[PDB]
Amino acid sequence: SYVEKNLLSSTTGAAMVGLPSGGNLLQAQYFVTPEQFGAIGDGVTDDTQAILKTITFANTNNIQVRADKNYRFTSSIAMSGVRWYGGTFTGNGGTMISTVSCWMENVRFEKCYVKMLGGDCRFYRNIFSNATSTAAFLMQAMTSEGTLDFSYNEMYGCKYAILQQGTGEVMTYGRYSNNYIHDIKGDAIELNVVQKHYTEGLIIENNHIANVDASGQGANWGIGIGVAGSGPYGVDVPDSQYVRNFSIVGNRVYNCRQCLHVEMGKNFTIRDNEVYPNTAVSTGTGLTTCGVALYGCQDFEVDGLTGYLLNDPSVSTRMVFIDWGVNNGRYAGPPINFTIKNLDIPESSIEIATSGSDAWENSTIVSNINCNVFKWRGLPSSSTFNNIRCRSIDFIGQHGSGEGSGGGFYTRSQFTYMKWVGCTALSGDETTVSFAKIYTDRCDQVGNNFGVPTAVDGTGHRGPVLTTISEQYFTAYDEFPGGREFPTGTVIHCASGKKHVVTVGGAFFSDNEKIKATVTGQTYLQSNALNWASNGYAKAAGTKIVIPGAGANGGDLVTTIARATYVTNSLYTIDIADPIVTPTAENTQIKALNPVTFVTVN
Amino acid sequence: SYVEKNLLSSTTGAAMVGLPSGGNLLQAQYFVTPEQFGAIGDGVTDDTQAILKTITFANTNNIQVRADKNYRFTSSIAMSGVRWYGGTFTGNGGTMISTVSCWMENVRFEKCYVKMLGGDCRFYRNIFSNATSTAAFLMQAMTSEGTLDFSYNEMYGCKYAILQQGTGEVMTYGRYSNNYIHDIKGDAIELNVVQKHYTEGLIIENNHIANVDASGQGANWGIGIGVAGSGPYGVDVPDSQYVRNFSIVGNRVYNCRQCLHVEMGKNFTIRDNEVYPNTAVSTGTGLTTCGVALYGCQDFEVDGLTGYLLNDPSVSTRMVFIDWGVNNGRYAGPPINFTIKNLDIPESSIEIATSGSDAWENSTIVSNINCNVFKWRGLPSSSTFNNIRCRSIDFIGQHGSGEGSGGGFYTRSQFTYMKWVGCTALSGDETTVSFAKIYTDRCDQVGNNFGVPTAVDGTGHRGPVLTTISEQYFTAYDEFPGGREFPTGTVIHCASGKKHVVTVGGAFFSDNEKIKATVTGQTYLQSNALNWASNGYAKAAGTKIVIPGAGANGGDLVTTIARATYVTNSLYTIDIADPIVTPTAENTQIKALNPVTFVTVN
Amino acid sequence: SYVEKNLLSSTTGAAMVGLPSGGNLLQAQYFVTPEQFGAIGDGVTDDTQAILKTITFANTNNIQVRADKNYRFTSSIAMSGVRWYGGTFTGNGGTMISTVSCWMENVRFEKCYVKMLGGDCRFYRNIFSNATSTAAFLMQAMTSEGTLDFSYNEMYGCKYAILQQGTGEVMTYGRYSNNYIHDIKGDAIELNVVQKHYTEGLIIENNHIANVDASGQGANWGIGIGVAGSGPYGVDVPDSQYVRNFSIVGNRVYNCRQCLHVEMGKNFTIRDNEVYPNTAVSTGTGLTTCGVALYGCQDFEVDGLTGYLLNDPSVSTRMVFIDWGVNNGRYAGPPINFTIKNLDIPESSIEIATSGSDAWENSTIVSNINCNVFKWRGLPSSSTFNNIRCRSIDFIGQHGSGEGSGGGFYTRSQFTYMKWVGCTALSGDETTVSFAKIYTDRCDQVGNNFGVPTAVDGTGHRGPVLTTISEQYFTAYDEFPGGREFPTGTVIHCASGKKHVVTVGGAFFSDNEKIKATVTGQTYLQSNALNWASNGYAKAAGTKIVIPGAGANGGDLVTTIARATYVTNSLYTIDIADPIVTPTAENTQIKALNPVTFVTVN
Ligand SMILES: [Cl-]
Ligand SMILES: [Cl-]
Ligand SMILES: [Cl-]
Ligand SMILES: [Cl-]
Ligand SMILES: [Cl-]
Ligand SMILES: [Cl-]
Ligand SMILES: [Cl-]
Ligand SMILES: [Sr+2]
Ligand SMILES: [Sr+2]
Ligand SMILES: [Sr+2]
Ligand SMILES: [Sr+2]
Ligand SMILES: [Sr+2]
Ligand SMILES: [Sr+2]
Ligand SMILES: [Sr+2]
Ligand SMILES: [Sr+2]
Ligand SMILES: [Sr+2]
Ligand SMILES: [Sr+2]
Ligand SMILES: [Sr+2]
Ligand SMILES: [Sr+2]
Ligand SMILES: [Sr+2]
Ligand SMILES: [Sr+2]
Ligand SMILES: [Sr+2]
Ligand SMILES: [Sr+2]
Ligand SMILES: [Sr+2]
Ligand SMILES: [Sr+2]
Ligand SMILES: [Sr+2]
């Protein structure tokens, strides 16, 4: 009639306790807890053996674990098939918990790390804090094929946060999404030599990363998000060496030396990421500071990039860096077949080194850019440049040895195509472009604020020599419009029916031009002879001019007209973009940097 | 040998009950519940004191709370460090629960609100229903710095859903993602005067908002998603006044008066949002109806917008509104250094007011647009317009007082650049554009279906006067092609070697043109003299013409040719875009709106 | 003084057991479990009646269910208002669980399916495995209006994964996000005849789908993501027949016959999806292999597509397929008012069939494309084509019967506009385009590597006959530049003031051209007469030429110059793109495919 103590305390004693359902308390045990196997959970007492017994019971009986205290442990723990919800694991700093086919939510991994060994693992709403192991979440030498969803976790205070080394059985599919990774000393997400993995997709999306500083650490530590296939680099190496079909989308990477990195990737997309590189972090690791660094990649797109560098522009403005690989220091594996678009990074610069050959196609597309320096090396079989707004262009087509990565390695004698449409090189009043070695068979160019010169690599080798006419103008008057630079081939049609054809691109300044005396520091010039408010002796802003003897130590000053003709103090006046250095005397001549030659028909 | 009642009912009595693990029931208590502290949970009985005792025990012993009933409470509850899973809190309407460093999942907050006071707070899969407080989730006067993940929650029936006021300690990082907010009477997500916050990122992403109607509420209530820095507005005010580096991405805002709002923002992106504004909601609050409203912002991008307004187009079609700020009613802080792209809103209109000066750069980019009215005021130092498809253009460059926000405030005498490439202004058969006060030093334009006129602000002030030749044509015949509008400077090259140069843009209609009598309502005209199927007397659709006396009260009818020459009833025939109003008699003349002048060479 | 067994085992017996809080164990029962109602949970014993009793108790008492074992069940179970966390349900293969207003997390549905009947249902972090029912998650004939969040679930081994049939009460809002669906035999996400649904939004986002193979299954089985309104198709059918305002964003669809499908959709966006179609799966179901298939849709955008087909290109390269609908085999419902952009699919092809009329507007925009074949049928009222990089163009404007879907059905006599800007048709050395029946009133074209011919549909019907001059060149020399194709109307301006006007587009090859003998397989030609390294007898790569008698069976060989003039073996040499077939003897002539005619002025 009464309850016996030894029956109530037995392993079936809970069956003696009724519940509102009409069932009993034994039927309510849908979980176990570590404390039932001897765990103290005070974060100090060594609970390793209790955790091991909990895992064995959970595995043996296929029952989930619930926990809420803090289990100090001091040697490796191996979990397989476990569902674990809640609690904190506290290691010695870098103590390992391995997982095969485990599902873990709401857990904190303090001063320890998880190593995934395979199966379908799922990690949601966990915290990985203060690991002193190489990585806080490691995939390495998996013993069975895996899939992974690693989402809505927070990671901080560690070295590497997420690290994969591709040796062993493959991860066939993985999603790394919506994680918050911050204040770390290695890489945030690094998937290294994983070319055999992710046949059914690698997606790294909407992760928020902040403060990645590997200063004092080893070589190449400190990347934000990195994905790497396997060398050797080379234009014709097998597809199987590359990591393929992956996507890096919607991530935010703040205060990191090299925010996004791919090497030996193929058929991938880097889409709509926001990056803030900083030269001041990860000092000594050898990484090129930038937002996106791609080495030896093929068949890829970069679409959508915002941000700027946190350091002063005098240290670096490099944001996009696309380069050849290197095998034992020798350039190899030019980037080919790629599309770069929607880079809204006006403070920051783009540096691309590519190539082109008769032995393989390389088609490049660059579109919808807003950047600082646009620097380019290499001459693809076809290259298009559309709606690029930049502050300067530094461009060599078939670059040679000493002119950038892989210079001199490949040439293309067959049909080579280029297009420039709707681009703008402008920094205030200055149009600053440099083009060379563009050995094209056809180059379409229209709508730009500059001309693109093309060149011939041996007589006859690019067909008949032609100059594209990119500018034509109508004037109501007959005199040649003064003070304005026109490219070679420009045609001016007059209302009278006369026509001017520019045979040497440049601007017209009369031989009778005279200016007033100038003093050091002056940024305006005034006419002492000609009517600068006439069309024939006009002065257009943006035109490059030379003021004899006004530069350093009586050299010639090359500058740009900053403001077109105006009258002040009863004198025709222009502003210049650079100050007088050496004073000049009354009735000095000004002239064009590039003096025009034209012929007039009728 | 038997179990004593007073031992079993003691605080350690559960240790007497064995479980299958070999442990005991005391070791299975990984949580507490409010009912253990006296809560009834019937949604009616006042459970405030029980909740307070639960929170104290959870804090004191660092133990999570589990709950599943409905706890009525009637005064403020303050939580710190709590993990709470499940249950409903029911207040009096606007009763407060404050949280510092709390983690809450699967909770319903009914007729109450949560105020975050700091720490790392995390809110997932909760419901915030029927709050009558100002906000359902409030961040205000935090006492410690915070981070927030507020994701996959549902909010409805309230006034403001999410509201931050920036006074107090800062939120260093926050993610507001994948929430569902609907049927509210204030703003859905409003982060106000938060310029000091979010140094490590503000991300508002993939939220779905529906039915925001603040009718009858106070001024500026009813914004969908709003972010605000601090005034005063001004082009040169310190960066520290602006909310910076944030992103508003992938959100859907349906049936809201002003879907997305930023003021005093800098270095931000508004990307891939879908918006359905409605003039009929939030009546009386003073908000400008639109999808995106930006005031006094700098260094920003709007990229990717879809949707349309739910009201009739006769009320409004305004979708994108980018404007100066106002300080005590005076315009201040022009939007500068911005990029607007990928707006696929063909029914809806864009209104932008900007500026340009010698004292600072302003570079604007507008690209890849599909809209209704394109309305623009202001003359940046550089502005590019590319692949804009619109139904009309309403454009003033250096707008003066009375021509829009900040008109007359700033001018730029230095080099001013503009580009129009590949744009289309078309509404059926009509090309409707208006441009004025474009005081540019250089304007590149190509590939448009209209010409852009530029102007001179004082003789000589923009260099030699030139007309860009945007159209050249070849004809196999010598006669000037009739009935088609050509801009000034157009060149026609004939197979014979003759050339025509258009010195006054317009179309050719012979002085001998005669039409048949017309009646009111007629939308075709027929020739009574000339062969409209000849090239010299041709009739091109899209050309603007004048029919003397055919308009209202015998005024001239200005219309557009809707269909080029065809024969019906044995007569040359064209269609017109507007009906005859006043009948016209046989042998009335038709003429161009803009009569051409050209010269012929040879 | 002692505990009585019958009191402890009663429904209030738990109140006798004290807990650390000072409360009792009865107050800790925040849930029930199925085992408390007789469930065995061994995956074999029939637990149907126990599950039913659990659901009744949970409903009656409004209490959540916790579970962790495996409940075999054998007939339908109906849940309403239930919160269920954990456990596995195992059916007979296709046993049904219906849900109204249910919330389910961490559940596995094995060999069974869930049918949603309405209310606010929420499904997170579940597994749907090995269903043999038609669908694993079904929405059909709902009895109350619903909303759905179906997110972070995994589904595999089934026929259809997610299926909606729109009969019954409507889903007003649904989010299907971040699911992982793989290895299935029906569609992954199919929402069929849902035009009345989703008034407040349908969002299908960030789902990862792999291996959809409906081989041997019924007609149209095997779509990845499909959304369908209701027929009949037609340009003027009511808006209420269409599914509207939905979005398909950020999804990945791998190894599926037709990855994304819409029919009878309006005002929708298909944005930033990654697709890998495969002709080898879903054999026999009648689906057109492609990444995006749209039928009879209006007012839509496709923006952002990457991927390629997994089969060999010789089977198919079709990636984007936009077509008319069909009513009982008759074409109906042309796609109108659409924007296609940012397709980075260089290996794969685009096929679009549209139309244009006087009775309705159709404005199309195609921009920023990188594709293989660009195939187009139809003549909209306005169409723009910008920055399209392709390997060939197959284009008919006003296509007739036998020239594609709906050929001959509609024509537009009113103003018809077209624009081609900045496009490139190039495959190595070949520019391969075909255009016909472009009956435009105005066509702006600039910056392309090809000319677009326009046509006249009756004398006078498109205004005066004009040829747009797309290319003008300057030469320092007077002789006509040889060996290079120039379109009709091209103007060459010489430094001397002479001018050449091309009256018949083509290339110049002198009548005195002679080549050395050739043998079968040869891919170079050598001069036996003229100096190919002169400008007048030059040889430009990309130019099409004819070698008499060198083709199959002594026919003429039409080929392309692959490499411009070079000297080897002391002979002027060019390479050709196709090998000699029939040998040719010494002093055979080579000529242009398209011989130029030009006139010289002066
Ligand atoms: Cl190489
Ligand atoms: Cl560096
Ligand atoms: Cl101001
Ligand atoms: Cl309004
Ligand atoms: Cl139809
Ligand atoms: Cl097929
Ligand atoms: Cl001429
Ligand atoms: Sr598997
Ligand atoms: Sr698998
Ligand atoms: Sr911090
Ligand atoms: Sr290859
Ligand atoms: Sr690709
Ligand atoms: Sr300067
Ligand atoms: Sr912190
Ligand atoms: Sr922090
Ligand atoms: Sr509703
Ligand atoms: Sr500034
Ligand atoms: Sr920016
Ligand atoms: Sr009309
Ligand atoms: Sr409802
Ligand atoms: Sr509703
Ligand atoms: Sr598999
Ligand atoms: Sr319609
Ligand atoms: Sr639309
Ligand atoms: Sr985009
Ligand atoms: Sr070939």
Q: Which of B429, B424, A448, B427 is nearest to C365 (CA)?
A: B424
C-alpha of residue A226 to centroid of ligand 10, in Å: 23
Residue whose C-alpha is closest to residue C88's, from A409, A309, A103: A103
Residue type, C319: M
Cβ within 8 Å, pair A447-B442: no
Measure the CA–CA gap between B288 and B296, rounded to whole angstroms.
15
Cβ neighbourhood burial of C80 (10 Å; 0-12, 13-18, 19+): middle
Name the residue facing B30 among A11, A29, A68 (closest C-beta).
A68
What's the 3-state SS for B462-529? Answer: CECCCEECCCEEEECCCCCCCCCCECCCCEEEECCCCEEEEEECEECCCCCCCECCECCCCCEEEECC
Bridge partner list, B560? B544
Q: How was this structure determined?
A: X-ray
Nearest CB partner across the interface for B467, out of A180, A306, A473: A473
Tell me the CA–centroid distance for residue B550 and ligand 13, in Å. Answer: 58
- Long-range contacts: B491-497, Cβ < 8 Å, 24+? B491/A472, B491/A474, B491/A493, B492/B598, B493/C469, B493/C489, B493/C491, B493/C501, B495/C501, B495/C503, B495/C599, B496/B602, B496/C599, B497/B602, B497/C499, B497/C501, B497/C599, B497/C601
CA distance C144 to chain A (A): 30
Answer whether B327's CB lies under 8 Å from B231's CB: yes
Torsion of CA B450, B453, B454, B455, to 10 degrees: -170
Half-sphere exposure of A594 (CA within 13 A, CB side): 16
Q: Compute, in angstroms, the gap from residue A361 CA to the centroid of ligand 11.
A: 9
Cβ–Cβ under 8 Å, residues C372 and C390: yes
Smallest-distance ligand from the CA of A427: 13
Residue B348, phi then psi, degrees to nearest 5: -125, 160
Q: Report the C-alpha gap between A542 and A576 in whole angstroms.
A: 9
Ligand 8: distance of its center to the CA of C224 in Å? Answer: 20
| Alpha carbons B329 and B464: distance in angstroms, whole number | 41
Strands (E), B334-372: 336-344, 349-353, 363-370
Whether C441 sits inside 8 A of B540 (CB atoms) is yes
Residues C319 and C390: their CA atoms lie apart, in Å, by 13
Q: Which of A305, C32, C533 is nearest to A322 (CA)?
A: A305
Dihedral sign for Cα atoms in the order B280, B281, B284, B286: negative
How far apart (Å, rounded) are the C-alpha atoms in residues B212 and B183?
A: 6
B399 in Cβ contact with B437 (< 8 Å): yes
* B275, B370, B598: best to mutate for the C interface, most C CBs within 10 A: B370
Q: What are the backbone angles phi and psi of residue C50, rounded to the nearest 5°?
A: -65, -40
Residue of B4, B29, B482 lying closest to C19 (CB–CB): B29
N-to-C CA span, chain B: 128
Let me know the angle formed at the C-alpha of C522 by C516 and C528, rounded to the nearest 5 degrees: 10
SS3 content of chain A, % helix, strand, coil (to 5): 5, 50, 45
* Strand C325-327 relative to strand C330-332, pairing: antiparallel
Nearest-by-Cβ selection for A464 from C2, C87, C540: C540
**A359: how many CB neighbours lie within 10 A of its CB?**
10
Tally B–C CB contacts below 8 A: 275
> Which residues, at least 6 apart from A101, have a Cβ–Cβ distance to it below 8 Å?
A80, A81, A118, A119, A120, A121
Query: Distance, CA B80 to ligand 14 centroid (Å)?
Result: 16
Q: Rounded distance, CA B127 to CA B123, Å? A: 10
What contacts A235, CB < 8 A, 6 or more positions away? Answer: A332, A333, A334, A336, A355, A357, A360
Hey, are the CB atoms on C417 and B428 less than 8 Å from each other? no
Nearby residues of B528 by Cβ (< 8 Å), 6 or more positions away: B514, B515, B516, B586, B587
Other Cβ atoms within 10 Å of C228 Cβ, number: 24
The answer for residues whose C-beta is within 8 angstroms of residue B526's C-beta and 6 or more apart is: B515, B516, B569, B571, B572, B573
For residue C489, the chain B residues in CB contact (below 8 A) are 473-474, 493
Resolution of the structure in the document, Å: 1.8
**DSSP of B15-36, one letter per residue?**
GGSB-TTSSBGGGG--EE-GGG
Residue B150 token pair: 């507020």
Q: DSSP alpha helices (H): ranges in A400-460?
A: none
Are A414 and C533 within 8 A, CB to CB?
no
Mutate: best of C253, C272, C560, partner A, most A CBs <10 A: C272
Residue C336 Cα to ligand 24 middle (Å): 11
> In 3-state terms, what secondary structure has residue A28?
helix
Contacts with B536 from chain C: Cβ below 8 Å? 464
CA atoms of A447 and A421, how far apart (whole Å): 6
Cis peptide before A380 (omega within 30 of 0): no
Beta-carbon contacts of C570 under 8 Å, excluding residues fewer than 6 positions away, are none
CB contact under 8 A, A361 and C428: yes
Q: Shortest CA distance to A68 belongs to which of A90, A86, A81, A55?
A: A86
- DSSP character string of B245-262: S-EEES-EEEEESEEEEE
C14 vs A contacts (CB less than 8 Å): 17-20, 25
Q: What are phi and psi of B472, to 5 degrees?
A: -135, 145
Measured between alpha carbons, how far is A318 from B34 in angstroms, rounded to an integer?
A: 57
Per-residue tokens: A334: 């030019």
Backbone angles phi, psi at A335, to 5 degrees: -70, 130
Identity of the residue in A413, A419, A465 whose CB atom sits nearest the CB atom of C563: A413
Distance of alpha carbon A353 from alpha carbon A453, whole angstroms: 20
Encoded tokens for C83: 């919160």
Evaluate the omega torsion of the peptide bond into residue C232 and state whether it is cis, within 30 degrees of 0: yes
Sign of the CA dihedral A566, A568, A570, A575?
negative
**Tokens 């006769």 -> residue:** B314
Determine the residue of chain A that is closest to C153 in CA distance.
Answer: A149
DSSP H or E segment with residue A146: strand A146-151
What DSSP state is assigned to residue A480? P
| Residue recorded with tokens 């095997």 | C222
Find the radius of gyration of the CA atoms of chain B: 34
What CA–CA distance (Å, rounded) separates A577 from A560?
5
Radius of gyration, CA atoms only, chain A: 34
Task: Please give the Cα distance from A475 to B294 (Å, whole number).
Answer: 42
For chains A and B, CB pairs below 8 A equal: 275
